[PDB]
């Protein structure tokens, strides 16, 4: 027999954060956003207690897609009907709804789970410099 | 204050007056055993193992773990074998850390 | 030997009886040692001697 390891008993050290996606790549921003949301980078990681900090993303429309992906890569959404497959190009996503694009990209990098719903909830993505989230006093960190 | 001992094959971090469970040591209850292999003690950590660093422990009980039923079954192959295991342990509490 | 403790010479009385119907744990369950679905596994038997 042996000594069991310490696991957090639903302890919430969660904090609020701010990042600026002025010129960040979509994938490079999404991977670090997922890591921050899951709390994998935290010293004590108990993978059933959602010990991950909140995150707010500013300037979503200002993100970039390298190469010809703004006109050659398509995002697909199918309703339960026939023919309800809506397609949007990279440029159209970058203009019409950029917040949804970043939200979907971050969601895709999470495990199929019942906690991933709460994890994707803790991502507040905005398309402008303004945000109604200044009451949380969120700390500012770059490229995360 | 703390030490890293190696009883059996596992490594235990032990404080003063801490009771941990190890594999059977063949020692009667009540004796004063001296664990030899010590990795880290206080702040001086020896690379293979610390020399002369001894962990003094007292054996509390020699009980057995919970019964485990191993039922091997090969589906649609006329093979249903059953077995039981009750692994013996020994519980010991740290008394003093030899300098 | 008394009538309350009477014993045979070892390896003279009791030998392993091959019970053909009592479970697979004895190695003689289900099929009971006949094989599988052929003439020798039916109730008839092993045909004729010399056949």
């Amino acid at each position: 027999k042996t000594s069991m390891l310490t696991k957090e008993q639903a302890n919430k050290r969660r904090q609020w954060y701010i990042v600026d996606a002025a010129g960040l790549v979509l994938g490079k921003l999404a991977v670090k956003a997922a890591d921050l949301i899951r709390g994998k980078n935290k010293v004590d990681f108990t993978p059933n207690q959602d010990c991950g900090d909140y995150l707010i993303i500013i300037n979503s429309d200002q993100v970039v897609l390298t190469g010809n992906k703004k006109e050659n890569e398509f995002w697909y959404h199918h309703s339960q009907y026939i023919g309800g497959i809506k397609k949007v190009s990279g440029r159209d996503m970058l203009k019409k709804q950029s917040d949804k694009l970043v939200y979907n990209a971050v969601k895709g990098m999470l495990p199929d789970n019942r906690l991933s719903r709460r994890w994707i909830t803790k991502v507040h993505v905005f398309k402008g410099d303004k945000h109604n989230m200044e009451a949380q006093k969120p700390t500012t960190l770059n490229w995360s | 204050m703390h030490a890293i001992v190696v009883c059996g094959s596992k490594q235990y971090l032990v404080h003063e007056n801490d009771t941990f469970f190890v594999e059977k040591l063949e020692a009667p209850v009540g004796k004063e055993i001296q664990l030899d292999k010590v990795l880290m003690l206080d702040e001086k950590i020896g690379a293979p193992y610390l020399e002369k660093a001894r962990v003094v422990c007292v054996v509390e009980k020699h009980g057995l773990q919970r019964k485990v039923n191993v039922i091997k079954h090969i589906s649609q192959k006329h093979h249903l074998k059953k077995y039981g295991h009750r692994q013996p342990y020994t519980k010991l509490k740290v008394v003093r850390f030899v300098h | 030997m008394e009538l309350n403790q009477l014993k045979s010479v070892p390896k003279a009385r009791n030998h392993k009886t091959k019970t053909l119907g009592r479970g697979h744990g004895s190695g003689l369950g289900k099929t009971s040692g006949r094989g599988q679905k052929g003439q020798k596994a039916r109730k008839s038997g092993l045909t004729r001697p010399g056949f």
Binding site: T2, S3, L5, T6, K40, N41, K42, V43, D44, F45, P47 | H2, I4, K10, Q11, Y12, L13, L39, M40, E43, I45, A47, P48, Y49, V68, N69, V70, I71, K72, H73, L80 | -
Partner: protein, 118 residues
């Protein structure tokens, strides 16, 4: 001599039923479904003992990897430095140190960092 079955079938059946206690509906009531669930549960328990031995190692590796990235060092080089310095400590106890004894865990990383190998 007509031997009649009674208390033989029921006892061995109730053992299986007792093992399958806490199941969903008929999986604890009927002997047949209870027997199947116990066998399947035994298979699961066997497989998950092996898988527990591997999954807890992975969790310790993850925690240790995280604890190192805060200081600028990586897991792949930390273990190499540990080997060259002859230090032999489980990732379990090392992770337990980084969660319980931050100062002493930092002491181990400081020695493996720069001190002469052996």
């Amino acid at each position: 001599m007509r031997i009649k079955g009674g208390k033989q079938t029921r006892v061995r059946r109730k053992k299986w039923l007792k093992q399958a206690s806490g199941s969903f509906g008929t999986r604890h009531a009927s002997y047949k479904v209870a027997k199947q669930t116990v066998i399947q549960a035994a298979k699961y328990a066997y497989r998950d003992r092996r898988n527990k031995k591997r999954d807890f190692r992975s969790l310790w590796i993850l925690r240790l990897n995280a604890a190192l990235r805060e200081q600028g060092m990586t897991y792949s080089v930390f273990i190499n430095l540990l080997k060259k310095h002859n230090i032999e400590i489980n990732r379990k106890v090392l992770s337990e140190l980084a969660i319980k004894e931050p100062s002493k865990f930092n002491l181990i990383v400081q020695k493996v960092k720069s001190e002469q190998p052996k």
